[PDB]
Amino acid sequence: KMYEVKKRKLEDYKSIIGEEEVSKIQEKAEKLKGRSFVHVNSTSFGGGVAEILHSLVPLLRSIGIEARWFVIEGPTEFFNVTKTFHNALQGNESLKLTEEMKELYLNVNRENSKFIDLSSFDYVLVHDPQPAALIEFYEKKSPWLWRCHIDLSSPNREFWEFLRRFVEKYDRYIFHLPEYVQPELDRNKAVIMPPSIDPLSEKNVELKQTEILRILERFDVDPEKPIITQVSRFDPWKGIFDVIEIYRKVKEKIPGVQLLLVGVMAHDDPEGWIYFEKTLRKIGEDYDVKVLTNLIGVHAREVNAFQRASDVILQMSIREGFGLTVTEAMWKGKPVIGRAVGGIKFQIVDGETGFLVRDANEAVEVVLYLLKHPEVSKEMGAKAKERVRKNFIITKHMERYLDILNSL
């Protein structure tokens, strides 16, 4: 039941990246002019990958590459199975792979493969596990790349042994960061490509001051008082309780300080909602702390407003992937205080773009320092934006793809 998904042009980013960068990109694109580059995944809706593809595809076409995008479809059971796969591959050991599951998985993949001859494109890229087995139903005549968005450092063995038979047939395995790659795979075929942000999406586009204020008021956020923020999915290893504590320490000296705990989570995330509830219990009736989620109307655009209005942003994760929330904050010129883990450690240049702290106590002095030194804050912020502009925006993401395709 596979379907292809139905305006972004490199020109739209010229003002952001400069003519030089634009030429460099067009240069690399030249060598691939006319070639078909197709993407395959499981959804054209929501944020994350889908959101990026909605801009990346038209963006590639603007530089002359026949980029197309297809989404596989399947019964709800297929996704319950792939949901199980996702968790198992990321480490959950209590899950079991049954023959019924393998079959359903392979059959759904077999079905989707009938809709279009993916093997006829010059370059085929498959995102994540759900459609990895598509490479199995064609006569491979060109390069097939596997884009992995999850953590495969220590997978439930039986699920990985099953999936690797398909994955091993790809010419490249593209991971977010080192800590997520599966070390068993051929070293020269495994490649690192961090996720990126699209400066023009709802989450990152620069909002007008009137809109930001209209959003802050709607959520009872006072822009005239200090604001510290952490946007993250509610989970136990995100330092949410540490941030609450940091906020309380800071409040002893800056009584008007407000804390924004922002998070968007699927309804299919009980553990997340359970933690969300425990956070509200911990906070109690201190309403200077705002818990902002999609349960109560928070979406991309308001998350955008919350980050812009923040004086300081934190990311006290104990566990973290690349950490795009840090990328978003840095793009908005905000100094970020975080723990040196995953992409947080990679993105923050301590003392330059933000600060890497070890515990809550350090975090406290740094937010107080930043609150006291707005000039240092602006400085670090500008440098933080510059680092994102040169490394983690969608056009650099697209350029990384060109480099890969060209190396084939």
The CATH number linked to 235 is 3.40.50.2000
Phi, psi of 94 (to 5 degrees): -80, -10
Return d(Cα 325, Cα 318) in angstroms, integer. 15
Give the residue among 36, 16, 44, 14 at the shortest CA–CA distance from 26. Answer: 14
Same domain for 224 and 317?
Answer: yes
Give the residue among 9, 6, 7, 5 at the shortest CA–CA distance from 395. Answer: 9
Cα angle 314, 315, 317 (rounded to 5 degrees) comes to 150
What domain range includes position 92? 1-196+394-408
Q: How many CB atoms lie within 10 A of CB 61?
A: 16
Is-contact 123 408, C-beta < 8 A?
Answer: yes
Same domain for 47 and 66?
Answer: yes
Give the residue among 76, 77, 66, 56 at the shortest CA–CA distance from 9. Answer: 56
Phi, psi of 196 (to 5 degrees): -130, 170
Same domain for 91 and 2?
Answer: yes
**3-state class (DSSP) for residue 337:** strand
Is-contact 354 336, C-beta < 8 A?
Answer: yes
What stretch of H or E contains 261? Answer: strand 258-263
Return d(Cα 68, Cα 80) in angstroms, integer. 27
Same domain for 212 and 321?
Answer: yes
Return d(Cα 143, Cα 123) in angstroms, integer. 5
DSSP 338-372: EES-HHHHHH--BTTTEEEESSHHHHHHHHHHHHH
Look-up of token digits 């999915």:
233
Same domain for 103 and 174?
Answer: yes
Return d(Cα 215, Cα 219) in angstroms, integer. 6
* Ramachandran area for residue 273 (φ above 0: left; ψ -120 to 50: alpha; else beta): alpha
Same domain for 123 and 230?
Answer: no
Six-digit token pair at 73?
A: 């479809």
Return d(Cα 12, Cα 94) in angstroms, integer. 48
Is-contact 67 37, C-beta < 8 A?
Answer: yes
Residue 385 exposure: Cα atoms within 13 Å on the Cβ side: 15
Same domain for 181 and 44?
Answer: yes
Return d(Cα 129, Cα 135) in angstroms, integer. 12
- Amino acid identity of 283? I
Look-up of token digits 């491979």:
140
Please list, residue by residue across 113-126, b when 16 or more beta carbons sit within 10 angstroms of its beta carbon and e when fewer do: beebebbebbbbbb
**Cα-Cα end-to-end distance for the chain:** 31
Elucidated via: X-ray
Return d(Cα 370, Cα 228) in angstroms, integer. 11
| Count of residues making up the chain | 408
Burial class (CB in 10 A: 0-12, 13-18, 19+), 209: exposed
Phi, psi of 197 (to 5 degrees): -110, 150
Return d(Cα 370, Cα 348) in angstroms, integer. 16
Local structure of residue 297 (DSSP, 8 states): T
Return d(Cα 10, Cα 33) in angstroms, integer. 15
Distances (CA, A) of 287 to 26, 220, 221, 256, 312: 51, 9, 10, 11, 19
Same domain for 301 and 276?
Answer: yes
**3-state class (DSSP) for residue 110:** helix
86 Cβ contact list (under 8 Å, min separation 6): 128, 129, 150
Is-contact 328 363, C-beta < 8 A?
Answer: no
Same domain for 188 and 244?
Answer: no
Same domain for 268 and 161?
Answer: no
What stretch of H or E contains 44? Answer: none
Same domain for 159 and 233?
Answer: no
Same domain for 87 and 53?
Answer: yes
Is-contact 397 193, C-beta < 8 A?
Answer: yes
How many structural domains are present in the chain?
A: 2
Look-up of token digits 């959950």:
92
What stretch of H or E contains 325? Answer: helix 324-331
Residue 238 exposure: Cα atoms within 13 Å on the Cβ side: 21
Return d(Cα 192, Cα 173) in angstroms, integer. 8
Q: What is the resolution of this structure in A?
A: 2.2
